[PDB]
Ligand binder design. Structure first.
Ligand SMILES: O=c1ccn([C@@H]2O[C@H](COP(=O)(O)O)[C@@H](O)[C@H]2O)c(=O)[nH]1
Ligand SMILES: O=c1ccn([C@@H]2O[C@H](COP(=O)(O)O)[C@@H](O)[C@H]2O)c(=O)[nH]1
Ligand SMILES: [Mg+2]
Ligand SMILES: [Mg+2]
Lengths: 194, 194
């Protein structure tokens, strides 16, 4: 009865691409890097691995480091939009995020980040999972183009959230984008309501 | 097409009740405690709060402490059963667990625990969520009697896993139990297959 919306964290709420580039450049000032305009494909590490030998492992070391997730800046409009979305009648919002393989800091810092920006009561809305297809909802707003897993027919419509790495991608009809949080996300939600 | 089974962690895989009692008694040897045979109701803290003033907060302090989740012993047969279950043809297993409010240690230690007992490749199968009703599957094996959330009609059948706190409960037909991991869990799975 309530519309359920899954909102991805990295690349949708949290500025993973920007934070990564900044910290990569600072730690490795003598290595080549990929400017955001030149990013292509979900996997940062893979593009860096193509750019130079040993660069994938260096890239990985940035997001495995303590404070990487906690110190990510919110994307413009993301906190305000999600707060408003959650407050709408007949609308349930969950933050759905996939932790990295190295688990020392990432889960903890993602909870801390959500507490920081959305408050203690929002922690109840976090779902941490590597497989988003087993989470049921009406909508999933997520910057990754290919979302697959154990469920071959997920219940959600995946709305692609624009990011540097996907901005040039042609989608198969009838796949839809949310171009930024300034774009009209209420229209997208409303299209799914009775 | 593959049968999907959600297996709860505390009280099903990990011996939360036993670990809690042991550590409570050791930390607070002068306080009254609740023997496992006398446990009633999901909420440990609530029963302790009825037992004596200030005991709820003392109980909470045990599972908020570092190493509490990591040091939980597996329940008898749980690791062997879940390993076997995951290896079955046409069967996908996810571990579905609700972290406590205090997030400093709990998420991290639950990942570490799953790595310890099931190996690195099993980390992909963990779902951390306060709301299990938004995770879709054929079966949920979980020791908590009342499993509710944002989805009024979850896709799973909830099979109640016996625990000290629920062993006396009469369920509404046609709700079903798994009495322990020595009980015939394959029959329960098979009952859900085409
Ligand atoms: O090349 C990459 C790019 C992203 N990620 C990880 O993928 C997950 C996606 O996070 P979210 O967008 O689901 O929040 C993050 O934990 C991020 O660190 C990688 O492991 N490798
Ligand atoms: O009185 C209680 C009893 C259990 N729990 C918590 O409920 C969650 C259930 O874990 P799981 O059975 O979903 O793995 C655990 O994080 C456990 O610490 C409480 O907060 N209070
Ligand atoms: Mg993302
Ligand atoms: Mg449990």
């Amino acid at each position: 009865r309530a519309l359920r919306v899954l909102v991805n964290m990295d690349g949708v709420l949290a500025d993973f691409e920007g934070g990564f580039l900044r910290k990569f450049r600072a730690r490795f000032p003598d290595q080549p890097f990929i400017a955001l305009e030149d990013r292509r494909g979900f996997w940062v590490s893979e593009q860096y691995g193509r750019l130079r030998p040993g660069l994938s492992e260096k890239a990985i070391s940035i997001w495995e480091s303590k404070n990487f997730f906690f110190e990510l800046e919110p994307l413009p409009g993301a906190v305000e939009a999600v707060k408003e979305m959650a407050s709408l009648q007949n609308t349930d919002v969950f933050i759905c995020t996939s932790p990295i393989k190295m688990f020392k800091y990432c889960p903890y810092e993602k909870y801390a980040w959500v507490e920081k920006y959305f408050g203690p009561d929002f922690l109840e809305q976090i779902v941490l999972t590597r497989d988003k297809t087993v989470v049921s909802a009406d909508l999933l707003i997520d910057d990754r183009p290919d979302i697959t897993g154990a469920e071959p027919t997920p219940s959600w419509e995946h709305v692609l959230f624009t990011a540097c790495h996907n901005q040039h991608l042609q989608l198969q009809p009838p796949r839809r984008r949310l171009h930024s949080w300034a774009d009209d996300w209420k229209a997208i939600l409303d299209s799914k309501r009775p």
